[PDB]
């Protein structure tokens, strides 16, 4: 079956070369100036809470998975092993990490074959 | 005002480094095996007609502009000069060219500041 890859990255490091879709989340609320959140990542509960208190964050996740679901039946049959969705913020530590996690969890919940990767955190 | 750039490219040449959003259209009907269409581009009427006879082509354009419109108000105010939407097929000659053109025409019709670019055709 098609493997759905959800990856976060920082635009400052360049777009990942395996991406098929790229979504920029630099318009979402930015935790960069709260000093307590700066050293954390979007895997951490305070950063997730900072993001989820804003309505547009859940709406971005919901609308993005809905958009992808329009094409998924045709992609699952596109001579294709992978569908790679890359979520980018500037540094790849906070917003993109959280959003990629939430998308990956949503598609896992739908029974899809999924994998996540955080390009900045893995360094 | 925010300048909306719509660019086509071929994944075989790599993702353009100025892209903010990237949409893969390799699942749309492929004119590669009709020999009359192969040397043409998505600027040409026979290629546009080949694509537009399939319902999913118009739906992709409509759904993609609608998705972008969810975020445009927040992007038009993201300390941002450009919003660059890159549409990719394998070679960047047919599907991506057509789709980028149609998106650019749609946002021009809404009074947005727009520019188009076809990375493969310009070579």
Author numbering:
A (entry chain A), B (entry chain A): 159 to 281
Sentences from the study reporting this entry:
In phylogenetically diverse bacteria, the conserved protein RapZ plays a central role in RNA-mediated regulation of amino-sugar metabolism. RapZ contributes to the control of glucosamine phosphate biogenesis by selectively presenting the regulatory small RNA GlmZ to the essential ribonuclease RNase E for inactivation. Here, we report the crystal structures of full length Escherichia coli RapZ at 3.40 Å and 3.25 Å, and its isolated C-terminal domain at 1.17 Å resolution. The structural data confirm that the N-terminal domain of RapZ possesses a kinase fold, whereas the C-terminal domain bears closest homology to a subdomain of 6-phosphofructokinase, an important enzyme in the glycolytic pathway.
Using limited proteolysis, the C-terminal half of RapZ (encompassing residues 154–284) was identified as a domain that could withstand digestion. Analysis by SEC-MALS (size-exclusion chromatography with multi-angle light scattering) and AUC (analytical ultracentrifugation) indicate that in isolation this protein domain is a homodimer. Well-ordered crystals were obtained of the purified RapZ-CTD, and a native dataset from a single crystal was collected at 1.17 Å resolution. Overall, the electron density was readily interpretable and allowed residues 156–281 to be modelled. The protein forms a crystallographic dimer with a symmetry-related copy, burying 1051.5 Å2 of solvent accessible surface area as determined by PISA analysis. This self-interacting interface is likely to account for the stable homodimer observed in solution. Of note are a cluster of basic residues around an extended loop on the surface of RapZ-CTD, including arginine 196 and lysines 251 and 281. During the process of modelling and refinement, clearly defined electron density for a non-protein ligand was observed in a pocket composed of the side chains of residues His190, His252, Arg253 and the backbone of Thr248 and Gly249. During optimization of the protein crystals, we found the addition of malonate to be extremely beneficial for crystal growth, and a malonate molecule accounts for this density excellently. RapZ-CTD unexpectedly exhibits distant structural homology to the fructose-6-phosphate binding domain of PFK, suggesting a common evolutionary origin.
